[PDB]
Write an enzyme that holds these catalytic residues in place. Structure first.
Site, PDB file in Angstrom:
ATOM      1  N   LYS A 117      38.252  50.013  68.834  1.00 37.77           N
ATOM      2  CA  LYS A 117      37.769  48.679  68.267  1.00 37.77           C
ATOM      3  C   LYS A 117      36.635  47.992  69.064  1.00 37.77           C
ATOM      4  O   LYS A 117      35.956  47.031  68.556  1.00 37.77           O
ATOM      5  CB  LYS A 117      38.978  47.766  68.138  1.00 37.77           C
ATOM      6  CG  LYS A 117      40.049  48.410  67.161  1.00 37.77           C
ATOM      7  CD  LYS A 117      40.990  47.319  66.685  1.00 37.77           C
ATOM      8  CE  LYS A 117      42.228  47.812  65.877  1.00 37.77           C
ATOM      9  NZ  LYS A 117      41.832  48.852  64.947  1.00 37.77           N
ATOM     10  N   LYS A 141      36.997  43.526  74.442  1.00 40.03           N
ATOM     11  CA  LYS A 141      37.159  44.871  75.067  1.00 40.03           C
ATOM     12  C   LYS A 141      35.788  45.522  75.262  1.00 40.03           C
ATOM     13  O   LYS A 141      35.511  46.114  76.282  1.00 40.03           O
ATOM     14  CB  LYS A 141      38.133  45.795  74.220  1.00 40.03           C
ATOM     15  CG  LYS A 141      39.596  45.341  74.464  1.00 40.03           C
ATOM     16  CD  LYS A 141      40.025  45.869  75.925  1.00 40.03           C
ATOM     17  CE  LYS A 141      41.569  45.967  75.987  1.00 40.03           C
ATOM     18  NZ  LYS A 141      41.929  46.562  77.300  1.00 40.03           N
ATOM     19  N   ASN A 156      44.095  55.257  67.247  1.00 37.48           N
ATOM     20  CA  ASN A 156      45.292  54.575  66.807  1.00 37.48           C
ATOM     21  C   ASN A 156      46.477  55.371  67.243  1.00 37.48           C
ATOM     22  O   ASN A 156      46.675  56.567  66.764  1.00 37.48           O
ATOM     23  CB  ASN A 156      45.306  54.384  65.273  1.00 37.48           C
ATOM     24  CG  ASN A 156      44.559  53.118  64.845  1.00 37.48           C
ATOM     25  OD1 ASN A 156      43.353  53.053  65.004  1.00 37.48           O
ATOM     26  ND2 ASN A 156      45.298  52.069  64.329  1.00 37.48           N
ATOM     27  N   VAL A 204      51.341  51.045  61.284  1.00 36.00           N
ATOM     28  CA  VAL A 204      51.537  51.337  59.886  1.00 36.00           C
ATOM     29  C   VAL A 204      52.642  52.378  59.595  1.00 36.00           C
ATOM     30  O   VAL A 204      53.325  52.290  58.541  1.00 36.00           O
ATOM     31  CB  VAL A 204      50.224  51.725  59.201  1.00 36.00           C
ATOM     32  CG1 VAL A 204      49.710  53.103  59.664  1.00 36.00           C
ATOM     33  CG2 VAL A 204      50.352  51.664  57.656  1.00 36.00           C
TER      34      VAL A 204
HETATM   35  N1  LIG Z   1      47.729  50.378  69.965  1.00 36.50           N
HETATM   36  C1  LIG Z   1      47.593  50.745  71.228  1.00 36.50           C
HETATM   37  O1  LIG Z   1      48.546  51.105  71.888  1.00 36.50           O
HETATM   38  C2  LIG Z   1      46.273  50.732  71.918  1.00 36.50           C
HETATM   39  C3  LIG Z   1      45.165  51.352  71.340  1.00 36.50           C
HETATM   40  C4  LIG Z   1      43.970  51.330  72.031  1.00 36.50           C
HETATM   41  C5  LIG Z   1      43.913  50.706  73.272  1.00 36.50           C
HETATM   42  N2  LIG Z   1      44.982  50.093  73.829  1.00 36.50           N
HETATM   43  C6  LIG Z   1      44.815  49.418  75.154  1.00 36.50           C
HETATM   44  O2  LIG Z   1      45.627  49.977  76.224  1.00 36.50           O
HETATM   45  C7  LIG Z   1      46.170  48.894  77.063  1.00 36.50           C
HETATM   46  C8  LIG Z   1      47.701  48.886  77.006  1.00 36.50           C
HETATM   47  O3  LIG Z   1      48.090  49.262  75.670  1.00 36.50           O
HETATM   48  P1  LIG Z   1      49.634  49.054  75.367  1.00 36.50           P
HETATM   49  O4  LIG Z   1      49.821  49.474  73.905  1.00 36.50           O
HETATM   50  O5  LIG Z   1      50.468  49.531  76.537  1.00 36.50           O
HETATM   51  O6  LIG Z   1      49.606  47.456  75.286  1.00 36.50           O
HETATM   52  P2  LIG Z   1      50.923  46.559  75.455  1.00 36.50           P
HETATM   53  O7  LIG Z   1      52.175  47.430  75.373  1.00 36.50           O
HETATM   54  O8  LIG Z   1      50.704  45.193  74.817  1.00 36.50           O
HETATM   55  O9  LIG Z   1      50.822  46.370  77.062  1.00 36.50           O
HETATM   56  C9  LIG Z   1      49.800  45.597  77.735  1.00 36.50           C
HETATM   57  C10 LIG Z   1      50.587  44.739  78.749  1.00 36.50           C
HETATM   58  O10 LIG Z   1      49.669  43.734  79.186  1.00 36.50           O
HETATM   59  C11 LIG Z   1      50.458  42.853  79.991  1.00 36.50           C
HETATM   60  N3  LIG Z   1      49.612  41.639  80.235  1.00 36.50           N
HETATM   61  C12 LIG Z   1      49.043  40.872  79.264  1.00 36.50           C
HETATM   62  N4  LIG Z   1      48.334  39.833  79.805  1.00 36.50           N
HETATM   63  C13 LIG Z   1      48.408  40.020  81.140  1.00 36.50           C
HETATM   64  C14 LIG Z   1      47.941  39.299  82.294  1.00 36.50           C
HETATM   65  N5  LIG Z   1      47.200  38.175  81.965  1.00 36.50           N
HETATM   66  N6  LIG Z   1      48.286  39.781  83.582  1.00 36.50           N
HETATM   67  C15 LIG Z   1      49.042  40.881  83.829  1.00 36.50           C
HETATM   68  N7  LIG Z   1      49.580  41.613  82.797  1.00 36.50           N
HETATM   69  C16 LIG Z   1      49.313  41.191  81.458  1.00 36.50           C
HETATM   70  C17 LIG Z   1      51.725  42.644  79.102  1.00 36.50           C
HETATM   71  O11 LIG Z   1      52.954  42.657  79.839  1.00 36.50           O
HETATM   72  P3  LIG Z   1      53.717  41.262  80.332  1.00 36.50           P
HETATM   73  O12 LIG Z   1      54.086  40.513  79.037  1.00 36.50           O
HETATM   74  O13 LIG Z   1      54.906  41.928  81.106  1.00 36.50           O
HETATM   75  O14 LIG Z   1      52.635  40.500  81.198  1.00 36.50           O
HETATM   76  C18 LIG Z   1      51.711  43.892  78.165  1.00 36.50           C
HETATM   77  O15 LIG Z   1      52.988  44.567  78.171  1.00 36.50           O
HETATM   78  C19 LIG Z   1      45.590  47.579  76.562  1.00 36.50           C
HETATM   79  O16 LIG Z   1      44.424  47.314  77.359  1.00 36.50           O
HETATM   80  C20 LIG Z   1      45.134  47.912  75.149  1.00 36.50           C
HETATM   81  O17 LIG Z   1      43.917  47.226  75.010  1.00 36.50           O
HETATM   82  C21 LIG Z   1      46.162  50.112  73.172  1.00 36.50           C
HETATM   83  C1  LIG Z   2      46.688  43.134  62.466  1.00 32.85           C
HETATM   84  C2  LIG Z   2      47.121  43.880  63.683  1.00 32.85           C
HETATM   85  O1  LIG Z   2      47.990  43.430  64.433  1.00 32.85           O
HETATM   86  N1  LIG Z   2      46.478  45.016  63.964  1.00 32.85           N
HETATM   87  C3  LIG Z   2      46.975  45.823  65.093  1.00 32.85           C
HETATM   88  C4  LIG Z   2      46.979  47.307  64.725  1.00 32.85           C
HETATM   89  O2  LIG Z   2      45.611  47.671  64.462  1.00 32.85           O
HETATM   90  P1  LIG Z   2      45.244  48.651  63.190  1.00 32.85           P
HETATM   91  O3  LIG Z   2      44.956  47.729  62.040  1.00 32.85           O
HETATM   92  O4  LIG Z   2      44.251  49.665  63.603  1.00 32.85           O
HETATM   93  O5  LIG Z   2      46.693  49.421  63.055  1.00 32.85           O
HETATM   94  P2  LIG Z   2      47.743  49.433  61.788  1.00 32.85           P
HETATM   95  O6  LIG Z   2      48.769  50.422  62.271  1.00 32.85           O
HETATM   96  O7  LIG Z   2      48.228  48.036  61.381  1.00 32.85           O
HETATM   97  O8  LIG Z   2      46.732  49.938  60.649  1.00 32.85           O
HETATM   98  C5  LIG Z   2      46.701  51.390  60.434  1.00 32.85           C
HETATM   99  C6  LIG Z   2      45.902  51.646  59.137  1.00 32.85           C
HETATM  100  O9  LIG Z   2      46.915  51.365  58.142  1.00 32.85           O
HETATM  101  C7  LIG Z   2      46.459  50.321  57.280  1.00 32.85           C
HETATM  102  N2  LIG Z   2      47.606  49.503  56.888  1.00 32.85           N
HETATM  103  C8  LIG Z   2      48.280  48.699  57.766  1.00 32.85           C
HETATM  104  C9  LIG Z   2      49.368  47.890  57.373  1.00 32.85           C
HETATM  105  C10 LIG Z   2      49.696  47.945  55.989  1.00 32.85           C
HETATM  106  O10 LIG Z   2      50.645  47.234  55.559  1.00 32.85           O
HETATM  107  N3  LIG Z   2      49.011  48.749  55.141  1.00 32.85           N
HETATM  108  C11 LIG Z   2      47.994  49.546  55.500  1.00 32.85           C
HETATM  109  O11 LIG Z   2      47.413  50.289  54.671  1.00 32.85           O
HETATM  110  C12 LIG Z   2      45.384  49.552  58.044  1.00 32.85           C
HETATM  111  O12 LIG Z   2      44.397  48.840  57.217  1.00 32.85           O
HETATM  112  C13 LIG Z   2      44.743  50.698  58.864  1.00 32.85           C
HETATM  113  O13 LIG Z   2      43.838  51.464  58.060  1.00 32.85           O
HETATM  114  O14 LIG Z   2      47.631  48.122  65.722  1.00 32.85           O
HETATM  115  C14 LIG Z   2      47.267  47.962  67.113  1.00 32.85           C
HETATM  116  C15 LIG Z   2      48.594  48.135  67.891  1.00 32.85           C
HETATM  117  C16 LIG Z   2      46.421  46.686  67.422  1.00 32.85           C
HETATM  118  O15 LIG Z   2      45.870  46.572  68.513  1.00 32.85           O
HETATM  119  C17 LIG Z   2      46.146  45.600  66.378  1.00 32.85           C
HETATM  120  O16 LIG Z   2      46.471  44.243  66.712  1.00 32.85           O
END
Ligand SMILES: NC(=O)c1ccc[n+]([C@@H]2O[C@H](COP(=O)([O-])OP(=O)(O)OC[C@H]3O[C@@H](n4cnc5c(N)ncnc54)[C@H](OP(=O)(O)O)[C@@H]3O)[C@@H](O)[C@H]2O)c1
Ligand SMILES: CC(=O)N[C@H]1[C@@H](OP(=O)(O)OP(=O)(O)OC[C@H]2O[C@@H](n3ccc(=O)[nH]c3=O)[C@H](O)[C@@H]2O)O[C@H](C)C(=O)[C@@H]1O
Ligand SMILES: NC(=O)c1ccc[n+]([C@@H]2O[C@H](COP(=O)([O-])OP(=O)(O)OC[C@H]3O[C@@H](n4cnc5c(N)ncnc54)[C@H](OP(=O)(O)O)[C@@H]3O)[C@@H](O)[C@H]2O)c1
Ligand SMILES: NC(=O)c1ccc[n+]([C@@H]2O[C@H](COP(=O)([O-])OP(=O)(O)OC[C@H]3O[C@@H](n4cnc5c(N)ncnc54)[C@H](OP(=O)(O)O)[C@@H]3O)[C@@H](O)[C@H]2O)c1
Ligand SMILES: NC(=O)c1ccc[n+]([C@@H]2O[C@H](COP(=O)([O-])OP(=O)(O)OC[C@H]3O[C@@H](n4cnc5c(N)ncnc54)[C@H](OP(=O)(O)O)[C@@H]3O)[C@@H](O)[C@H]2O)c1
Ligand SMILES: CC(=O)N[C@H]1[C@@H](OP(=O)(O)OP(=O)(O)OC[C@H]2O[C@@H](n3ccc(=O)[nH]c3=O)[C@H](O)[C@@H]2O)O[C@H](C)C(=O)[C@@H]1O
Ligand SMILES: CC(=O)N[C@H]1[C@@H](OP(=O)(O)OP(=O)(O)OC[C@H]2O[C@@H](n3ccc(=O)[nH]c3=O)[C@H](O)[C@@H]2O)O[C@H](C)C(=O)[C@@H]1O
Ligand SMILES: CC(=O)N[C@H]1[C@@H](OP(=O)(O)OP(=O)(O)OC[C@H]2O[C@@H](n3ccc(=O)[nH]c3=O)[C@H](O)[C@@H]2O)O[C@H](C)C(=O)[C@@H]1O
Ligand SMILES: CC(=O)N[C@H]1[C@@H](OP(=O)(O)OP(=O)(O)OC[C@H]2O[C@@H](n3ccc(=O)[nH]c3=O)[C@H](O)[C@@H]2O)O[C@H](C)C(=O)[C@@H]1O
Ligand SMILES: CC(=O)N[C@H]1[C@@H](OP(=O)(O)OP(=O)(O)OC[C@H]2O[C@@H](n3ccc(=O)[nH]c3=O)[C@H](O)[C@@H]2O)O[C@H](C)C(=O)[C@@H]1O
Ligand SMILES: CC(=O)N[C@H]1[C@@H](OP(=O)(O)OP(=O)(O)OC[C@H]2O[C@@H](n3ccc(=O)[nH]c3=O)[C@H](O)[C@@H]2O)O[C@H](C)C(=O)[C@@H]1O
Ligand SMILES: CC(=O)N[C@H]1[C@@H](OP(=O)(O)OP(=O)(O)OC[C@H]2O[C@@H](n3ccc(=O)[nH]c3=O)[C@H](O)[C@@H]2O)O[C@H](C)C(=O)[C@@H]1O
Ligand code: NA
Ligand code: NA
Ligand code: NA
Ligand code: NA
Lengths: 346, 346, 346, 346
Positions: free
Chosen positions: C135, C147, C175, C183
């Protein structure tokens, strides 16, 4: 209800802010006011995950979720604009984590409270209720000490701020039965696991109250506190030795008890009112109100004038309230749907 | 001396910094090390007047006077450069003023201590000794609570900083006989004025020690503390009812006694070691050393493991030490040149 | 393993710090290094509850739990002392919460990263890996924009800091399949609830990867990144229309599909490398490495000299990678134990 | 004029503040309102030299020159007292300098904008217009990313602040013809020097607009924006290959063209409205208005409800507007007095 007998307000144009709004009380307090006329409940905390969970479970357009941190006055100011009432529940509240990181406990629990009060006052909030703990009376660990200091700070602000501008008060309560990580779920898990019950000091006492009793205490302060008051709910207590027996008999179980000894950071009994607070308090019935002393910055109360009622009083603590019998502990245990479900399920 | 039996150091290349260096202890501690090999004593405080008075009275080129504030990390850093030892005595220490302005007590006593520790560590200071008070054990007023929290902060820093980098410890002491404004000068002034003695609660006890005993406790910590230790001097105590009699008999005077009652912010007796501290302490003889617990951030000491020695212990307080007789109070009173001069002069 | 073919290190004297250590990646990354020689894994976050849960589940004396906030340089400095490696995962990462509170996203994701880098550099940390997201490439919502800016900040710091002092790099990934709230769990819950599948735009594509693939990307950067690099894992993608079919066929279910439309803050396809990054990247095989450009502050690269390889390139996105077939999506879905358990259970 | 058809205001008691008031737009905007009834125009910037130059050239007692920095809330507050309208033009706007010092771009462009908004709100300013750039839509360089984040911040503030208190909006515009350092003066200098024209990518497009068109867009927002709106002026575009030909034919010159390649930090075409913005925008005619979405903090717009108009739309960019012919570029070039003077002079 949320309003004294012989009043009404209608909260139909009112906005409640709950700092630490995602934690256990914030939620129970939130879910109480959802049962009301309130225009908006803002949930203020740092954690976007817990906020999204709550949003999705309730789907209630009264609920608004603000990301922010009591440590940061700008982030508080955003959430505080147009607010009428504040329940300040944001805190670092775990003993070990405050003991190892006490500067974090001072930033959140003490400085974070001063930022909430300053912002509430600037924004013309009507009432701020600060949540505190019996661990703040004669405190021994960094978490209770930071909460005791938070109480001094909100009491000091109440002396210098008119009640009609912003009323500032707080609540102190005892041990909430079946808190995450607390001794009742612990013992149940040992019952179910076939493990011995680890008892710290069987003759240790703690005030016993439910989460629902804790929300009532906050509502009681909301309705009746005057600025500077600390409100405490009277409560009975249990010894740990008796609580363990109560659970064993209920679960018709004969797990052994193991004495592990008193842990660091713990007292034998907890105090809800110090000697001085008891001397000064008014008995409201199921509550005591501790009014703020020396509201005009009356140094001479600390220096040249005394109070013989203080000399004559003693502290209100979990040894000198009604200590419940095993039978009483059982009845009180059974009012919890957590205990019931675990019980049926066993 | 300033050095254990069987050691020597020579302080001939060493620099001592005293924060709050213009107050009563800073001065007595200053005047002790002037009796030494020390290269330089830096006196750090906010007040240019008190600094100029000291400079002019001593005319000693070892003494250097730094203007600065423990609240401000840059101002501490200036005074801390090249320092070997720090006696941290800067504090808001008056009960009423902390109770009405507790945020000032948190800025000076808690945040100000963290700034001193952080700067001392950055500058490779060898030792920092933080001064605390028996009012920090089971505290009830904002001044004692802020000092209890200061102790948690310096203990927490000692867990994360190696001893060989900077050793960090503190001292807690009781009531210094004939402090400015304290009860002995007060009563003498009443004796001489023909006024009744205002007794708060005659059965109230306080630990009794001289300023010289207080400097020895700091020197004892300087020589022997390990990082994280709290050092306490064992001390006898007096009831106020007995102290007043001791003074009356010495002054061959029959002023009446008037009971004014316990004042706000006061306990019946003061504690020097809590139950837990006593359980964990080592008896050094005329001192107890309370070592820091859980030096590796051992959560499990607060959560899953206990100590039966804690359950078995009790607190060390001014009721359970040796309470002196009127005769003993008199002998101890007569070791003070303040009492002697007033006595002769009467 | 954690070490390139033809190397060894032994992490037996090494300390790993994980900011945001309690979240999903922090934990998977934590649990990877528990499978190692590492001396200590410090988990740094703000939340004492999540920390206590992890502590109690693992009971591993390698794990140390630090309370602190990337927004506060002193609190980072405490946790960073003696650290060798940092995985910086602390972030506000939810789209709506960053969009409504973007100043909080700037304080945590941008300023919080600069504080971590500055502290790591002061403490002589060897490597810092910053986690980012697809993103952040051509971003459209406040979370991706913050980011993207975090990436510029760590790349800029890498130009001015020698690699041998502290190496600073980051990872961007797509994702993660079966993230909380994402999703796949959503659709499964609809399958099981008998509800229609809410499809936003069936022809929308997202890169598909597992949490385990995400940990490998971080380890890959840990082993091979040079300072200033952004490392991306090549990944296939799915259309949402196809993912929904894959789940329906697996669950042998005929819930209807409802088109709700594209939601705010979403793109049709996600980009892992912009045109410029692709032009400059090296293909490592299953990864691309995007090296930092203009490491000597070469303004003229932005102003007077060009690169025809940039003109000739195009962005790497979820439309132009391999878009999986329904069959492929199913096979990849079945490698998840979350999907398996839900499947068996259905 | 400065006022919609069918209104009047009289600015005779009104005060305009221009942050970044000494730069090119600040000046053109300043010189527009000098053509008005306005009581006072305050020019706010950091640079005393540029301020003295302007003062001395205009000698107009309406102009007041304030030294201050958008990074510093006290310095903004001084200049903001009694202000009615703010044109916020202070920014670090050069690509390479933001790319190498992105923390400076975050301090000025993002935090500096939040300070201006907070002060404007405290001072009861009526309107704040924030200047932004097409480089903030799908941004790729640190300057555009910081401007995109600035837009999220002012949009977020507009949701929580009533319009009647302070209205907050912004403008995004394209490439201003004959900006200092920009491609038209560059090419002219090459024409006159006998040097080849350095063309980056002849098929690259940029929106083309004059400084006067840029001031009109700000005035248009001043008159018609609602709080939270982003206003964009529709604009045609040129390819660089065609702009170079237009200049060569005008200057009756046969300098060769040299292709240097795309420079770092550049896109092939610029976007004025993203897909989502276009879907949500209202066509005002020569402008689009992008209203703020989810003004009540409507999470569900990002999570559970969609918009099929978004799926159906596409972005508004310099490839899909009217791309001018060489003849059109020439006519537009000739409306500039900079081009005319250089032309005559050649
Ligand atoms: N969907 C995904 O998993 C995804 C995809 C792409 C990139 N990322 C990136 O990868 C990283 C971690 O992903 P994740 O899925 O593990 O996220 P997550 O489970 O939300 O973990 C991030 C942690 O950040 C900690 N945090 C937030 N604000 C903070 C602060 N001000 N100081 C110290 N700690 C803090 C929180 O823990 P506490 O509440 O214990 O502080 C939270 O558990 C993030 O940078 C995210 O941008 C995630
Ligand atoms: C709004 C929100 O919280 N987005 C969080 C999320 O980011 P992304 O949107 O990439 O993920 P998703 O799994 O939700 O979408 C997957 C696909 O399914 C589609 N999608 C999703 C929900 C749905 O009901 N229907 C649907 O088609 C959707 O349009 C997409 O094409 O996931 C991570 C953890 C975050 O950082 C974001 O906060
Ligand atoms: N055992 C008990 O329940 C008990 C007993 C006596 C007194 N109390 C007191 O009552 C209050 C709430 O109790 P509780 O059991 O509801 O505690 P809890 O569930 O831990 O909730 C407190 C909330 O504080 C929030 N928080 C922490 N730091 C914050 C910050 N810097 N800014 C904004 N929010 C922050 C956390 O949510 P995020 O992670 O979402 O920020 C957390 O959910 C606390 O003050 C506690 O001292 C509790
Ligand atoms: N009754 C007692 O004597 C007693 C008993 C137990 C413990 N203690 C403790 O021992 C320490 C010193 O006792 P004491 O009797 O010497 O106290 P004291 O005479 O009041 O001296 C403390 C000094 O602190 C300095 N100070 C205050 N705020 C400061 C700041 N923000 N920055 C730098 N310096 C500052 C003041 O000097 P300037 O005005 O020159 O800044 C003051 O003279 C204190 O920590 C106190 O808590 C005292
Ligand atoms: N090429 C373009 O013209 C173009 C295109 C699209 C958008 N924009 C945007 O429109 C705005 C102005 O454009 P412009 O061409 O007039 O830019 P400009 O001539 O560089 O003027 C911006 C002014 O910002 C002032 N400034 C910078 N940092 C500041 C601070 N920290 N506090 C107070 N003032 C500060 C500078 O004056 P001092 O040195 O006197 O402080 C500078 O003259 C900028 O926001 C830019 O992003 C410009
Ligand atoms: C260490 C810790 O995290 N203490 C948190 C906690 O504070 P309290 O200690 O009051 O509660 P508890 O339910 O744990 O003890 C109940 C009684 O059972 C005894 N107890 C407890 C555990 C056990 O294994 N055995 C036992 O006898 C124990 O000695 C005591 O007599 O609960 C709240 C939520 C917090 O704020 C604190 O962080
Ligand atoms: C509750 C009620 O209506 N009883 C009234 C009736 O009192 P009771 O017969 O109940 O005996 P007590 O008050 O002596 O001690 C009871 C408990 O309170 C606590 N209590 C009491 C005194 C004190 O200094 N501190 C304290 O905590 C402590 O937990 C102790 O065990 O007469 C006195 C003079 C009153 O004013 C009461 O309102
Ligand atoms: C209010 C105040 O300023 N307390 C400062 C003070 O703390 P302590 O109270 O311990 O000392 P004191 O000498 O005043 O009391 C001695 C005993 O005599 C009793 N006392 C005292 C005065 C009196 O008129 N009658 C009386 O009986 C009294 O109840 C007690 O039992 O002294 C140090 C310097 C401080 O830090 C505090 O700010
Ligand atoms: C001083 C010396 O050499 N005596 C040794 C000799 O002890 P003694 O005969 O002196 O009686 P005690 O120790 O029972 O109580 C004395 C006072 O200490 C304080 N004390 C004691 C216990 C406690 O838990 N807390 C406490 O404050 C309290 O003020 C109490 O009134 O035997 C025990 C077991 C030891 O280890 C001693 O070092
Ligand atoms: C992977 C491998 O070993 N193939 C080598 C072999 O290439 P392939 O036959 O795979 O075709 P391509 O490279 O044209 O496009 C494939 C995908 O990559 C992405 N790709 C490609 C170009 C670009 O500018 N941007 C981009 O994202 C985009 O997702 C696109 O769909 O020859 C070229 C010249 C190489 O250098 C490769 O390493
Ligand atoms: C690097 C830099 O400082 N870019 C500043 C600038 O942003 P833009 O790049 O949009 O403007 P330009 O006039 O430079 O490019 C026009 C077109 O001609 C092309 N161009 C440009 C120079 C050249 O020698 N050859 C060429 O073909 C070029 O690829 C493009 O297609 O102008 C404004 C004032 C800024 O904010 C930026 O800091
Ligand atoms: C300007 C006018 O009055 N024309 C009306 C008349 O439209 P036109 O015949 O002009 O064709 P179009 O709208 O399809 O595309 C034209 C350009 O706009 C941009 N445009 C268009 C759609 C989009 O999603 N994104 C976009 O940027 C893009 O630059 C594209 O090249 O009918 C449609 C349905 C309208 O609503 C118009 O107001
Ligand atoms: Na008041
Ligand atoms: Na240590
Ligand atoms: Na470098
Ligand atoms: Na609004």
């Amino acid at each position: 209800g949320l309003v004294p007998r012989g009043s009404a307000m209608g909260f139909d144009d009112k906005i409640l802010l709950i700092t630490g709004g995602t934690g256990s009380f914030g939620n129970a307090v939130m879910k109480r006011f959802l049962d009301s006329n309130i225009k908006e409940i803002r949930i203020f905390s740092r954690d976007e995950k817990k906020q999204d969970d709550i949003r999705k479970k309730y789907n209630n357009s009264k609920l608004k979720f603000y990301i922010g941190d009591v440590r940061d006055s700008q982030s508080v100011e955003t959430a505080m604009r147009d607010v009428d009432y504040v329940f300040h529940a944001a805190a670092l509240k775990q003993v070990p984590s405050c003991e190892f990181f006490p500067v974090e406990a001072v930033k959140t629990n003490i400085i974070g409270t001063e930022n909430v009060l300053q912002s509430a006052i600037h924004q013309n909030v009507k009432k701020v209720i600060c949540l505190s703990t019996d661990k703040a009376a004669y405190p021994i660990n960094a978490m209770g000490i930071s909460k005791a200091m938070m109480e001094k700070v909100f009491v000091a602000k109440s002396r210098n701020i008119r009640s009609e501008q912003t009323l500032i008060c707080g609540t102190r309560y005892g041990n909430v039965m079946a808190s995450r990580g607390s001794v009742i779920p612990l013992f149940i898990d040992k019952i179910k696991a076939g493990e011995p019950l680890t008892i710290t000091d069987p003759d240790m006492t703690r005030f016993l109250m439910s989460l629902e009793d804790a929300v009532e205490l906050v509502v009681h302060a909301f309705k009746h506190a005057e600025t500077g008051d600390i409100m405490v709910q009277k409560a009975p207590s249990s010894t740990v030795g008796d609580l363990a027996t109560a659970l064993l008999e209920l679960f018709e179980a004969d797990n052994a008890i193991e004495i592990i000894g008193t842990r660091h950071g713990e007292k034998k009994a907890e105090t809800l009112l110090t000697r001085e607070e008891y001397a000064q308090c008014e008995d409201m019935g199921d509550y005591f109100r501790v009014p703020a002393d020396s509201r005009d910055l009356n140094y001479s109360n600390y220096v040249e004038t005394g109070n013989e009622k203080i000399t004559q009083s003693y502290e209100y603590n979990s040894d000198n309230t009604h200590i419940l019998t095993v039978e009483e502990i059982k009845e009180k245990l059974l009012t919890l749907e957590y205990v019931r479900n675990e019980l049926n399920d066993y």
